[PDB]
Ligand binder design. Structure first.
Ligand SMILES: CCCCCCCCCCCCCCCCCC(=O)OC[C@H](COP(=O)([O-])OCC(O)COP(=O)([O-])OC[C@@H](COC(=O)CCCCCCCCCCCCCCCCC)OC(=O)CCCCCCCCCCCCCCCCC)OC(=O)CCCCCCCCCCCCCCCCC
Ligand SMILES: CCCCCCCCCCCCCCCCCC(=O)OC[C@H](COP(=O)(O)OCCN)OC(=O)CCCCCCCCCCCCCCCCC
Ligand SMILES: CCCCCCCCCCCCCCCCCC(=O)OC[C@H](COP(=O)(O)OCCN)OC(=O)CCCCCCCCCCCCCCCCC
Ligand SMILES: CCCCCCCCCCCCCCCCCC(=O)OC[C@H](COP(=O)(O)OCCN)OC(=O)CCCCCCCCCCCCCCCCC
Ligand SMILES: CCCCCCCCCCCCCCCCCC(=O)O[C@@H](COC(=O)CCCCCCCCCCCCCCC)COP(=O)(O)OC[C@H](O)CO
Ligand SMILES: Nc1nc2c(ncn2[C@@H]2O[C@H](COP(=O)(O)OP(=O)(O)OP(=O)(O)O)[C@@H](O)[C@H]2O)c(=O)[nH]1
Lengths: 88, 175, 139, 49, 120, 72, 98, 347, 320, 55
């Protein structure tokens, strides 16, 4: 409701002041796909803050760090086999 | 009204699907899914699920779909069809309109829609449960178990993503 | 399978009109299925040719069902044989001859007579008996 | 000698072949041993011993 | 069918109850057939690789025969165990369900009227 | 001697399909190396016209040059 | 059963029809395949959140991170048929006639 | 590929199916199917030729769509029972949904047009992987949920595979296309017996797997992909063509070869289930498979075919690859009929 | 160990061995132009591996005991007969050319294997990219007809595709009358009565096709006999050139491993030479081919695999 | 007339001709994903609605 009201008011203000301004007067793909895979892997560790307060955080420590080294591992393989050095 | 807001959003969700299911221009088809993606989170948001809903915005709408239309941007022909163009595209759109109208009309008058799954036509709100959640968000405390109970899930989904990074280079290498 | 149930519920021979309508309904529905596939896997030029393919296929299949149901029923009570497989045998050839005239070839008409006549007797053969084509997993 | 190049299997791979007889005798002696204990166990459990 | 009978320790190629069966004798006709297949494997192996068939690396033939017999012998133990298991649990159900398997009554052929159809 | 198949017998097996049909009467046999023939070039080397719009060229510096999206 | 679920269920069906029917472009088909897992995501979250199946909240995040892997593969294949054929039209993809 | 990087792709998919056969959770089964697809695509495009690019695209779109259809089959079952375990399904349309979804992953019914084109585009070595290992993953799930299967639903899928596999196989020229159609025909046999007793479904799988490796790796040795190209191999390697003939007879199904292993027990099994018209059609239409087996048998070894002068040069050099497991695979696919009572081990 | 993929993982990388002196220089030219002589001088000057012209019996020299087999058993084509009468109904014209192309293909493979393994540069006269000039000459002169051309260039497409063009190609262009000026002296009965137009048709097909279709992929540097005796200059140009504009000095180690996979499998490089396309002039009948193979099989050594013939004194056969 | 004209054309040749015609039908496809997937949609529709497996 309040959230809907806020966004609705913003759209009208943008719409209203737009109207007064209209009537009154492989490398490219690779950067996209590499971001997509990293971004999806990023979503895995987003719940980390509350996950840091689990009662068995020791197992959390092994596996939360697991995803982070895989983030490095995915980049490391990407880097060594060209990868981030995009086609030029 | 306001009681049917989830129904209202669900209705926009369906017509949003007809936007891209009709297979318009890939940029325009993406936009039809972008709004469809946007409203779908609101359906989830109205049921709770803030974090699960927020991902649909972030890693899918602002994520997967950004590189989606990005690929359509540098690909595709020099003449992108405008939504009207081919009569089939508008025929598909109006076709999607008649399916949602007939069921919704059937839903709000007889409430005994049996298409495939028998579904009774009451308001969205007659399904919510009751009870206090204490001081922990049910959604937040569920997916936070990724590192306390999500043991075999993390091992497998992490391994495949690494294979995901290697498969994409191997296909894009060009031998 | 209400559509298939119509043919079974009506007694053999008796109520020839009901049998004929039900039988041609089965053939027409079958004609719809094959024609829909034909347009899908092998598209015609335009929509007018698409309905042209549907028109031929449905008319053939409906004709086979109509003639089979008519001949099978009209032969049953005339011969007073509500159980003899021959009541369906001439029905199969009735469709077989009907198909032959539909595609205008004597040879294919005779073959359709022989094949449909055998199967129609065989389909009847199981109706009196307990033959099951999709038997449940008893063991 | 005929062939200009010494052939891949011309020299007997003594390490590989002696291994194969090693598995062959090991596989047999375990089979003989397996049969005896199985026979003895069946002789015992089934009441004949 | 098996599959989930009471007591199904998974990935157990030889459950302990198999030790109560008469082990397959080394002179079993089934067992020597495994040996015969091993020899045929050896003959093909030399034939495919352009080798002098019979007298061509008899060490490979020995390995093929040994592997087939050994892998065979454990197979018959499982083969006999499951076959014995099928009849074992069978022989108890009939006792627990006697009315499901009623016994016939003694009627000699002197009273049974089997029709005699003449043959010409 | 015992009769053996000849080229006419062999070419019967040599068609694109065993049973000829006007629909398949034009289907060419697959390449033996499994390599389908490359098409022509599909490059997008647009020849950018630098110069008489951009102060970046410092003024009247019309440049004609082609590039692989970024590589001149 | 609430009409919001039937709204989702057709959303799969209309997405399913679009993916199967095809018009010209594989981009649209890849878009249609994404509506598949999308409508699956809201449907999964809706049931799981409604029933307070706490551990089952696993699956929504797990669902799309693997569905997005289809995009990683599906998008890549398109550009290759785009590099070789030109336009990625499905009609071009007919070399494997035999 | 880089040998170490092709290795993990070969066996990430090994593990993907391995997850399916061991997962007790519905989501995890989809996870293994995902890695199954995610590792299959690169292997199909090892050579990078437009046939492979097409074959990968056709394979990916089919498998991905079937995977998506599988998910909502999972969701509907969850929606009606709230159970993530793999057991008998608790709702009809969900049962109907995955049967078609799992079918398209395997490919027997009209969801089979991808099978010929994909294997034709991709290399022979990747052909065996697609036609042998990529069928255990869908079959493992089907054997698991066979109790809730719809008997009408599966059996009509089963014949439509063997009739299509039987019919179209006559007209095929490319050996990979013939092998694919026989795979479709063989796929129908165990899927038909699946509702009755899954032991014969696994038994048919194992035998069919053994026959296919014997077929594919021999063709790899022949280095031939066309019937005429296979025909020439009579002169250079007459022994291989003779073995080509025995496995063709075996995989045809003639007794006492191992092709009579699955059919006979399958024929017997359904006969105990009172379904007697059903076996007769499959046994009779199985001869359609035998005809183009005979067609290949005639052109391979039974009658020698004209050769070329340049292939005298071929005789001057020996083979290089050791074609591992070929000798044991052939023997295990020809003379195992007397070991029929070994099927009790599977159950 | 062999170059099996395990060896690649635990060691050998092709790029380590390659140095500047790792070219695939081919010295081509007209008939009796000294291209064999010039190639020998260049190779011994740089210490490379010179490969003599791939004849009909070159394949026999590459296997067995290096003994040229019987012509029926090793090609079924005599070049001398082709020079005597190319229009012979036996089809010796295209049969000789097609077998020669396969001989060059086998010759090219051995040079590639040595270059990839040792790293030392290789030299060979003619090429698999240059044998087309003879058949194109053999076409315009009426020696063959259209069907032979179609089979040959198709074989070129299905074989030469996965063989990149050499770093630099040497072409000694002696004028055709000057080649005539030396052939009367040569005195080899078959090769006297060549057609002057045919050797003229050697030269022009060399001129506007060989270099132009090789220039865009490699440097083409051209001389005549006066620079063949002056080989000290033809070698410093090799030093001067950077080996640019060539697809060799850009490939990574992955492709080299793939290349060694192909070459080490001798039948694989020969697999597409024996296309099942049935040209009448080269198709061996079933009965004749079966008898010839039986003749090949009864030959010593060829009965079994190498190292497996006790006829030639291979002891320990029972335990190999 | 009887042996190798009619008896040979009733059982053997007619079956061979029927298989030949049907083998043409099954094998002669177009290789178009649009048409293949359209067939999939129909099969999905008949199965979920018309095959009556659901009921
Ligand atoms: C029941 C009875 C019947 C079944 C019996 C069971 C065996 C069945 C298979 C028999 C053999 C089949 C075979 O290989 O045929 C030759 C055939 C052709 O071989 P090829 O000519 O070398 O071509 C294949 C590649 O292109 C070659 O590519 P390459 O040149 O890169 O060489 C790769 C090769 C050569 O080796 C290397 O490249 C070295 C790699 C070094 C790094 C890794 C080191 C550690 C490796 C071992 C780890 C354990 O290594 C591998 O393939 C490794 C695969 C295992 C990976 C293990 C690690 C996972 C983590 O093999 C294949 O095509 C392989 C397909 C995948 C395996 C078989 C799948 C089909 C059967 C599945 C069902 C089995 C029954 C299930 C019940
Ligand atoms: C008592 C109950 C029953 C009562 C009614 C009697 C039975 C139903 C009616 C008869 C059904 C079987 C006869 C065939 C019907 C379909 C005919 C058809 O499709 O004809 C078109 C076509 C043949 O012509 P075509 O080869 O295309 O050549 C001309 C091209 N311009 O077709 C083709 O090209 C393809 C071949 C025909 C289509 C495939 C096979 C369809 C029939 C399968 C069995 C149906 C059984 C129905 C009854 C039991 C189940 C309810
Ligand atoms: C179960 C469905 C199986 C569908 C298989 C589709 C491919 C193989 C059949 C085919 O291509 O055509 C069969 C049938 C008759 O084809 P018709 O319309 O006569 O056209 C002949 C000239 N192309 O055309 C069809 O579309 C009928 C297929 C279903 C028959 C029941
Ligand atoms: C179930 C029914 C039957 C099914 C199978 C039928 C098979 C034949 C069907 C027809 C096949 C097509 C037509 C013929 C194709 C011939 C293929 C071929 O390669 O033929 C030529 C080839 C020449 O022989 P070669 O390779 O030189 O080897 C000779 C032996 N060193 O020949 C060969 O390579 C063949 C070599 C055969 C070697 C046989 C070795 C026998 C060893 C016997 C050992 C006995 C031990 C006894 C011990 C007793 C005490 C335990
Ligand atoms: C080349 C074509 C065939 C040539 C001629 C071959 C012989 C002609 C007859 C073929 C018989 C095949 C089926 C026989 C298998 C055993 C059947 C049997 O023992 O009899 C049963 C007969 O039952 C049947 O229905 C069997 C099949 C009858 C025929 C239908 C199928 C066969 C014909 C079509 C397929 C073969 C023709 C070729 C088609 C391309 C008894 O069971 P029941 O029906 O009494 O069962 C108990 C209870 O009543 C429940 O049913
Ligand atoms: N028909 C035919 N003959 C060929 C082909 N390639 C090479 N030859 C023959 O190979 C033989 C040797 O080549 P020549 O140039 O005469 O050899 P040379 O006299 O040593 O002279 P150089 O090559 O200059 O050293 C000649 O008889 C050529 O005709 C070919 O493709 N076809």
């Amino acid at each position: 409701m309040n959230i809907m009201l806020t966004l609705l008011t913003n759209v009208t203000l943008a719409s209203l002041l737009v109207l007064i301004a209209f009537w009154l007067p492989m490398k490219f793909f690779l950067v996209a796909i590499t971001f997509l895979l990293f971004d999806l892997e990023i979503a895995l560790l987003l719940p980390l803050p509350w996950a840091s307060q689990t009662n068995n955080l020791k197992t959390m420590l092994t596996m939360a760090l697991f995803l982070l080294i895989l983030l490095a591992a995915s980049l490391a393989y990407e880097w060594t086999q060209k990868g981030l050095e995009w086609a030029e | 009204m306001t009681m049917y807001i989830a129904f209202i959003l669900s209705t926009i969700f369906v017509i949003g699907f007809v936007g891209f299911s009709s297979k318009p221009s890939p940029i325009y088809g993406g936009l039809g899914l972008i709004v469809s993606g946007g409203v779908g989170c609101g359906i989830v948001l109205n049921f709770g699920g803030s974090f699960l809903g927020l991902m649909v915005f972030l890693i899918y709408l602002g994520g997967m779909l950004v590189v989606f239309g990005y690929t359509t941007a540098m690909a595709t022909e020099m003449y992108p069809e405008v939504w009207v163009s081919n009569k089939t595209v508008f025929g598909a759109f109006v076709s999607g309109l008649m399916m949602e109208f007939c069921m919704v009309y059937y839903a709000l008058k007889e409430e005994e829609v049996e298409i495939i799954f028998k579904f009774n036509g009451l308001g969205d709100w007659v399904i919510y449960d009751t009870g206090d959640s204490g001081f922990f968000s049910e959604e937040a405390m569920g997916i936070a178990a990724l590192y306390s109970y999500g043991t075999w899930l993390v091992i497998v989904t992490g391994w495949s993503l690494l294979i995901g990074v290697v498969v994409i280079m191997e296909i894009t290498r060009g031998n | 399978k209400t559509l298939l149930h119509k043919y079974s519920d009506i007694p053999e021979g008796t109520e020839c009109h009901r049998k004929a309508y039900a039988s041609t309904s089965i053939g027409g529905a079958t004609g719809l299925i094959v024609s829909a596939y034909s347009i899908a896997l092998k598209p015609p030029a335009s929509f007018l040719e698409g309905v042209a393919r549907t028109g031929r296929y449905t008319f053939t299949s409906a004709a086979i069902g109509a003639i089979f149901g008519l001949t099978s029923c009209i032969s049953a009570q005339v011969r007073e044989k509500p159980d003899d497989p021959l009541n369906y045998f001439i029905g199969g050839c009735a469709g077989g001859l009907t198909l032959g005239a539909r595609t205008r070839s004597y040879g294919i008409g005779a073959a359709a007579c022989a094949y449909m006549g055998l199967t129609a007797a065989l389909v009847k053969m199981g109706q009196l008996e307990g033959w099951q084509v999709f038997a449940e997993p008893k063991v | 000698k005929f062939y200009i190049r010494e052939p891949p299997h011309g020299s007997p791979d003594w390490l590989k072949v002696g291994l194969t007889l090693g598995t062959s005798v090991f596989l047999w002696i375990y089979l003989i041993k397996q049969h005896k204990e199985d026979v003895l166990e069946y002789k015992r459990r089934n009441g004949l011993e | 069918m098996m599959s989930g009978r009471p007591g199904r320790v998974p990935l157990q190629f030889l459950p302990n109850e198999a030790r109560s069966l008469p082990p397959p004798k080394l002179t079993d006709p089934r067992l020597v057939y495994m040996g015969f297949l091993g020899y045929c494997s050896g003959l093909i192996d030399n034939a495919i690789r352009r080798r002098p068939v019979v007298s061509a690396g008899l060490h490979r033939q020995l390995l093929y025969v040994t592997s087939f017999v050994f892998f065979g012998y454990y197979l018959l133990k499982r083969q006999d165990y499951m076959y014995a298991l099928r009849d074992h649990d069978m022989f108890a159900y009939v006792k627990s369900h006697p009315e499901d398997f009623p016994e016939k009554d003694k009627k000699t052929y002197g009273e049974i009227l089997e029709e005699f159809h003449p043959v010409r | 001697r015992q009769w053996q198949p000849d080229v006419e017998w062999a070419e019967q097996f040599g068609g694109a399909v065993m049973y000829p049909t006007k629909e398949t009467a034009h289907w060419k046999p697959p390449p033996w190396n499994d390599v389908d023939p490359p098409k022509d070039t599909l490059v997008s080397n647009l020849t950018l016209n630098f110069g008489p719009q951009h102060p970046a060229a410092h003024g009247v510096l019309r440049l004609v040059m082609e590039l692989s999206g970024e590589m001149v | 059963m609430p009409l919001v679920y039937m709204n989702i269920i057709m959303a799969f069906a209309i997405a399913l029809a679009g993916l199967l029917m095809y018009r010209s472009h594989l981009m649209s088909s890849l878009l249609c395949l994404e509506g598949m897992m999308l409508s699956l995501f809201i449907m999964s979250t809706l049931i799981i959140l409604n029933t307070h199946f706490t551990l089952a909240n696993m699956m929504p995040i797990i669902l799309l991170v693997f569905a997005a892997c289809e995009a990683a593969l599906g998008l890549s294949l398109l550009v290759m048929v785009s590099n070789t054929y030109g336009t990625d039209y499905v009609q071009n993809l007919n070399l494997l006639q035999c | 590929m880089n040998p170490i990087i092709y290795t993990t792709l070969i066996m990430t998919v090994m593990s993907g199916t391995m997850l399916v056969m061991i997962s007790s959770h519905w989501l995890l089964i989809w996870i293994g199917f995902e890695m199954n697809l995610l590792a299959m695509i690169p292997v199909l495009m090892k050579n990078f030729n437009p046939r492979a690019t097409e074959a990968a695209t056709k394979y990916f779109l089919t498998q991905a769509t079937a995977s998506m259809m599988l998910m909502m089959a999972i969701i509907i079952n969850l929606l009606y029972s709230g159970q993530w375990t793999i057991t008998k399904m608790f709702n009809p349309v969900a049962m109907t949904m995955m049967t078609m979804a799992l079918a398209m992953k395997l490919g027997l019914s009209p969801f089979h047009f991808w099978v010929p084109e994909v294997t034709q585009g991709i290399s022979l070595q990747a052909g065996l992987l697609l036609l042998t290992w990529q069928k255990l993953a869908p079959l493992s799930v089907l054997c698991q949920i066979s109790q809730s299967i719809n008997p009408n639903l599966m059996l009509t899928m089963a014949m439509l595979s063997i009739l299509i596999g039987g019919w179209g196989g006559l007209n095929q020229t490319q050996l990979r296309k013939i092998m694919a159609y026989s795979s479709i025909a063989h796929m129908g046999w165990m899927t038909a017996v699946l509702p009755y007793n899954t032991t014969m479904t696994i038994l048919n799988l194992l035998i069919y797997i053994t026959m296919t490796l014997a077929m594919f790796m021999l063709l790899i040795h022949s280095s031939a992909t066309t019937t005429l190209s296979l025909s020439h191999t009579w002169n250079k390697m007459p022994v291989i063509t003779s073995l080509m003939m025995v496995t063709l007879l075996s995989m045809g199904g003639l007794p006492p070869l191992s092709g009579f292993m699955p059919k006979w027990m399958i024929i017997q099994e359904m006969t105990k289930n009172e379904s007697i018209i059903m076996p007769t059609l499959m046994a009779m239409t199985a001869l359609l498979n035998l005809y183009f087996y005979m067609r290949l048998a005639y052109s391979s070894s039974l009658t020698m075919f004209p050769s070329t002068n340049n292939m005298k040069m071929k005789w001057q050099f020996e083979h290089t690859k050791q074609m591992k497991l070929l000798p044991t695979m052939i023997v295990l696919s020809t003379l195992v009929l007397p070991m029929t009572p070994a099927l009790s081990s599977l159950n | 160990l062999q170059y099996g993929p395990l060896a690649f993982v635990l060691g050998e990388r092709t790029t380590r061995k390659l140095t500047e002196t790792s070219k695939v220089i081919t010295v081509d030219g007209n008939i009796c132009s000294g291209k064999g002589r010039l190639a020998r001088e260049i190779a011994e000057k740089l210490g490379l591996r010179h490969f003599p012209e791939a004849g009909i019996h070159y394949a026999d020299s590459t296997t067995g005991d290096g003994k040229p087999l019987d012509v029926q058993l090793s090609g079924n084509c005599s070049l001398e007969k082709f020079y005597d009468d190319p229009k012979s109904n036996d089809g010796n014209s295209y049969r000789l050319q097609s077998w020669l192309y396969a001989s060059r293909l086998l010759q090219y493979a051995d040079a590639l294997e040595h270059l990839l393994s040792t790293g030392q540069g290789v030299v060979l006269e003619r090429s698999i990219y240059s044998d087309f000039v003879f058949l194109e000459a053999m076409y315009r002169q009426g020696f063959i007809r259209k069907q032979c051309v179609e089979h040959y260039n198709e074989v070129k497409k299905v074989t030469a595709c996965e063989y990149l063009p050499p770093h630099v190609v040497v072409y000694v262009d002696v004028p055709v009358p000057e080649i005539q000026s030396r052939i009367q002296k040569k005195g080899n009965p078959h090769e006297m009565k060549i057609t002057a137009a045919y050797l003229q048709d050697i030269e022009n097909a060399y001129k506007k096709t060989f270099l132009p279709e090789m220039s865009e992929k490699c440097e083409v540097l051209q001389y005549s006999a006066r620079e063949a005796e002056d080989a000290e200059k033809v070698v410093e140009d090799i030093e001067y050139l950077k080996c640019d504009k060539g697809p060799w000095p850009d490939q990574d180690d992955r492709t080299f491993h793939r290349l060694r996979m192909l070459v080490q499998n001798k039948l694989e490089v020969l697999n597409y030479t024996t296309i099942p396309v049935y040209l009448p002039e080269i198709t061996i009948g079933a009965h004749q081919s079966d008898r010839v193979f039986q003749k090949f099989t009864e030959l010593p050594g060829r009965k079994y695999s190498p190292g497996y013939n006790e006829d030639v004194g291979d002891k320990w056969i029972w335990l190999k | 007339l009887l042996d190798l004209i009619w008896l040979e054309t009733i059982l053997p040749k007619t079956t061979s001709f029927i298989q030949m015609k049907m083998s043409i039908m099954v094998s002669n496809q177009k290789g178009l994903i649009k048409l293949y997937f359209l067939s999939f949609l129909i099969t999905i529709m008949i199965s979920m609605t018309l095959f009556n497996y659901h009921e």
